[PDB]
Write a protein that binds this ligand. Structure first.
Ligand SMILES: Nc1ncnc2c1ncn2[C@@H]1O[C@H](COP(=O)(O)OP(=O)(O)NP(=O)(O)O)[C@@H](O)[C@H]1O
Ligand SMILES: Nc1ncnc2c1ncn2[C@@H]1O[C@H](COP(=O)(O)OP(=O)(O)NP(=O)(O)O)[C@@H](O)[C@H]1O
Lengths: 650, 642
């Protein structure tokens, strides 16, 4: 009972040897010449990332002197501007990336630049941590970024000016570097100028527009003014001046509400390069394993190239950022296919990057991004007002939501509540599934729907004629994807969907059962009158009203289901000529009120071997197939029957 | 470069340095995406050691010294949490264990290779794999401590063990336990428990090391069940053998083994590509269409073709090397000259992807073209006919060559499919047009009122049965000079004799008739009415040149991947058609005698709306309203009884 004071443990490499002893511990070395060549020749895919790294280095340099500027009063001195400035020089085959950051002392120019996998930024980070404090803008981690500037240049000339030290010149050729004091005075007030002596194969980076698009591609949010010595050709002659590249302001960095509705729409217009305001937007911050904080958008109109090469075409609408630096627009694991219209940004600070800085190192961190992005998206679409949802949204991205029901399984219930279809409750207006079950009768327990090519052919369908007459609500499907969306949905609010073109619809009746038994002779004749496999059953329908009714099985293709499959291109030659083709099992149904009842029976009561009575019994079934929206086997069969029955009549 | 100064001066020069521990961490946690590549690297290293000791043997007679067997053996201890990769290669001296394993980016293989290139031997300059000295370090992706025991000739057996930080070397107190070679023992992490089950390892070596040119054995089970070494790589690299010295039966055996198929390939091709890139390749076409060939369609890379560099598996992702419509082509691609990324999972030069692609497609299409005509129609076209059609639409660079491979059902034979070169060889002396009809089936297409006069006159009509066919022909501007012509659209020009200009007189005879239909029958239904010059034995609907056919409309109306706007606001769905009227038709001649008798006549109007609606059905067009047609035909059936 009384606890003793003894404490347990919780934890603790063989080879068949007698005993293991210690001897001669070494430290790993490195052949620098071959390691350098690995980085330059066999590491990166795109050689354009050199500017991305040089700018990031310049950004870190700027952020460093800014932190020091806080705990100092003479840090900036003469020049208080913290800007990165890039200038081309085609006349001398040179590219310049100049910044006004902290710069580098002579010891640093040797140590930091001359040592692979050495990061002064990483070390600076460490001192700041030991010392709110916002290092969270420091991008550098590896020590190889600067060496990526040897991809497009034979020689790199680095001129740096650190406080309390002389301006020096650092020149290299990837094999060795020379460090010399600048003969000129402190031409640079403070900071660094990285000059690249480009190669003949890199003549592209001498041209202006190449650089402009390059800095805009990777570095447009790096929290420091980036200018490029550009031409304007106005006032009309060419005038050169520093043109700002990162115009856009990181709205995401600010917390909710600092900025309002206004500056949001402006952000969407500028970032996504759109002219019209977004239909909606969401600003949120996920935290935990992933912690990023992002802004997502839904466009006002459906993009022009939407649904073109669906699945294959990766959308560049969402751009991934890590520490204000662009990583990738590939969200095929962080965003599903049916949400390929959603635009926006995703920035983060502690997302582990690959050395390529184009992909996240941990593949496991992708789906945890998706679960938050998708959820925030579906909440955003749900947050859209009911009026605006039907009148504007659904026309644009209704198909997407339907596809979501088919694809996404973990959001099928949530997406189903966003579904909108036409109905019999209104000649034109669309309804939700929640609005259907709210208008459902007692003990209905079935959501009746009709699928067809158009609204007119669906509402004027022989099926559910008694259902509409009884007051049952019928959902009309007018688009090819509709039927699949419903078929992929098991139950909604405890109600099961029921196709009115297929069997399963059930509506005294026991007295009427005796009446059906009376209507037994004609059905038998139909199976004989009817060719071999022409029909399966010829019972009389109790769901008909005023129409002379091909009903599919519970596990059979509908007339509308059938037309879509048949018109689908991507299918093999062997597969096309298959699946039973046209016939399946065509069940006939009928109601008594006209020639269906006694007029056809009088002939059947007279003689079953008459030619006139077999022709009239054939055309009735013939036009019933088109009445039920099925494919006509022969256009000339039912066609010439009209050309002959109208010649003597008219 | 000059910079405002005319005094470029020379001061101190330095050599670059490295912070090893941080560069180590980069390789461990920030380089590779797949942690399973560790076994790929150890096998390659083991292979290199085996190739070195063999190259020495060719000049040194005392190298083997009673250890002639050159193999690789893998054994994993589940109980002891260990993984052993043992070879009988050249091994490493004590100095080499420190130099080669302790110096990052240092490759002893690269040094061994350069010595041979310097003088005359190019015998095995393509057998050695290791270039950058970082592969061995991928062992710490799945292991905390790596123990390496090596025995080199003319030196004692030493033991090398380490974590990422420091490494130690010690002479093995067990002595010469390995006759010659190396054993890399990996103390696997908790997470890397999967590499302890032999079957996981079994598939892993087979995945990458299938043609490593050295016997690889794994300690596995085989049924009383007993344990022994099982050979992994048995599939010989036949592509290295020249086209003349390779057995035709070997190709069939190679395919059924490499691609895991029970049936022989429909065809094969063996070629050596030189120039910008240099590689050997054996492409294959399966005997039957793979299930799910088009299920993903687009967005799906096919693991049918595999890329090998120096007999080591690189990748199966080809999408930049092979187009979508050739996703059925299987085979191998091997090179010894293609520069690789440090990850060894992709090519380094992206520009070379286009170079390989154009070579592979070229040899693929020629391979298809080489197939005998007799076996082509009966086997290939049935399985991959759809692919060729898609290729016509997609590949513009080879649209002509792919067109020569197209096959379609013609009116020249009840069931046989024909070539387009056969069609143009069966055209008249002044046809210069390829007439075709598109429909849901052949029965619908051959019994269509558009081909009535054409077949009677002596012209040939191609029948398109599959919905992708019209897309395929649309992508074709002209074939052998001739131009495709839709028989359901305007353009067909028939008869230039005196009987043709006599039809101009019939135009005036039908002029009051023509205008009546535009205003009696629904004016917003029928576009226009014109005299039908191409109509024989039928009552009655053509479309414009750049307009939808009845078939074309049937497909678009089923295309599910469209927005709710594009389907509701599509003009072609609401577009009207030109109604053509045949003069010889008895039902048409009695129609002009009824309007005059009773213009604004009710019965006269009725037949016109009925005929037009039957014309919509006779063509591929869907009836706008079927209830109005279904009720009026119920009144027509009242002729028997009311
Ligand atoms: N423009 C610059 N101004 C000032 N200091 C710089 C500049 N560029 C580089 N440095 C310093 O030199 C060090 C080496 O940089 P680098 O080798 O590019 O690795 P990095 O800074 O971590 N970038 P990366 O390898 O992509 O993570 C940096 O950590 C800085 O301390
Ligand atoms: N099992 C072994 N037997 C003999 N020598 C070995 C063995 N493993 C490694 N070595 C030597 O150690 C050197 C360093 O290994 P490694 O880091 O893999 O360089 P590598 O051969 O270029 N591998 P890779 O990265 O794929 O190019 C190799 O170049 C070999 O000379």
């Amino acid at each position: 009972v009384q606890r003793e004071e003894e404490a347990i443990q919780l934890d603790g490499a063989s080879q068949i040897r007698e005993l293991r002893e210690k001897s001669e511990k070494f430290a790993f070395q490195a052949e620098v010449n071959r390691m350098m060549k690995l980085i330059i020749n066999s590491l990166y895919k795109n050689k354009e990332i050199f500017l991305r790294e040089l700018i990031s280095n310049a950004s870190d340099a700027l952020d460093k002197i800014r932190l020091i500027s806080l705990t100092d009063e003479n840090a900036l001195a003469g020049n208080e501007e913290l800007t990165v400035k890039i200038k081309c020089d085609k006349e001398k085959n040179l590219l310049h990336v100049t910044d006004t950051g902290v710069g580098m002392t002579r010891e640093e120019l040797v140590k930091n630049l001359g040592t692979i996998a050495k990061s002064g930024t990483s070390e600076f980070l460490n001192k700041m941590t030991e010392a709110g404090q916002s290092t969270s803008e420091l991008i550098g981690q590896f020590g190889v970024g600067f060496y990526s500037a040897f991809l497009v240049a034979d020689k790199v000339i680095v001129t740096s000016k650190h406080n309390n030290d002389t301006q020096h010149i650092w020149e290299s050729d990837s094999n060795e570097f020379s460090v010399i004091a600048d003969p000129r005075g402190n031409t640079l007030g403070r900071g660094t100028t990285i000059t690249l002596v480009l190669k003949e194969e890199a003549s592209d980076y001498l041209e202006l527009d190449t650089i402009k698009n390059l800095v805009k591609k990777y570095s447009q949010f790096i929290n420091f003014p980036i200018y490029v010595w550009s031409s304007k050709t106005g006032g009309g002659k060419t005038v050169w001046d520093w043109e700002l590249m990162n115009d856009i302001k990181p709205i995401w960095q600010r917390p909710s509400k600092e900025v309002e509705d206004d500056e949001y729409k402006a952000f969407y217009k500028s970032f996504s390069k759109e002219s019209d305001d977004p239909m909606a937007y969401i600003h949120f911050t996920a935290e935990g394993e992933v912690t990023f904080k992002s802004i997502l958008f839904v466009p006002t109109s459906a993009p022009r190239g939407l649904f073109d090469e669906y699945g294959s075409k990766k959308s560049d609408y969402i751009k991934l950022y890590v520490r204000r630096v662009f990583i990738t627009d590939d969200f095929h694991d962080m965003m599903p296919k049916y949400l390929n219209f959603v635009k926006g940004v995703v920035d983060s600070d502690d997302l582990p990057l690959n050395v390529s800085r184009e992909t996240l190192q941990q593949h496991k961190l992708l789906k945890v991004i998706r679960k938050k992005l998708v959820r925030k998206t579906l909440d955003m679409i749900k947050k859209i007002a009911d009026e605006k949802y039907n009148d504007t949204f659904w026309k644009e991205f209704g198909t997407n939501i339907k596809l979501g029901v088919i694809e996404d399984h973990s959001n099928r219930t949530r997406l189903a509540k966003l579904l909108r279809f036409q109905s019999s409750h209104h000649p034109s207006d669309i309804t939700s599934l929640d609005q259907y079950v709210e208008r459902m009768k007692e003990k209905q327990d079935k959501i009746y729907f009709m699928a067809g090519s158009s609204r007119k052919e669906a509402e004027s369908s022989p099926f559910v004629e008694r259902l509409l007459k009884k007051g049952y609500e019928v959902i009309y499907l007018t688009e090819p994807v509709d039927e699949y969306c419903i078929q992929a949905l098991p139950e909604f609010d405890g109600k099961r969907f029921q196709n009115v073109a297929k069997e399963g619809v059930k509506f005294t009746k026991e007295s009427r059962e005796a009446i059906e038994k009376e209507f037994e002779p004609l059905l038998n004749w139909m199976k004989d009158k009817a060719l071999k496999d022409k029909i399966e059953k010829a019972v009389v329908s109790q769901r008909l009203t005023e129409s002379p009714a091909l009903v599919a099985s519970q596990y059979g293709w509908s007339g509308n289901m059938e037309r879509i499959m048949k018109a689908q291109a991507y299918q093999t030659g062997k597969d096309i000529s298959t699946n039973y083709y046209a016939s399946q099992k065509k069940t006939f149904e009928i109601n008594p009120r006209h020639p269906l009842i006694k007029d056809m029976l009088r002939r059947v009561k007279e003689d079953e071997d008459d030619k006139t009575v077999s022709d009239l019994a054939v055309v009735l079934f013939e036009t019933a197939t088109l009445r039920s929206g099925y494919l006509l086997p022969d256009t000339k069969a039912y066609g010439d029957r009209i050309e002959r029955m109208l010649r003597l009549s008219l």
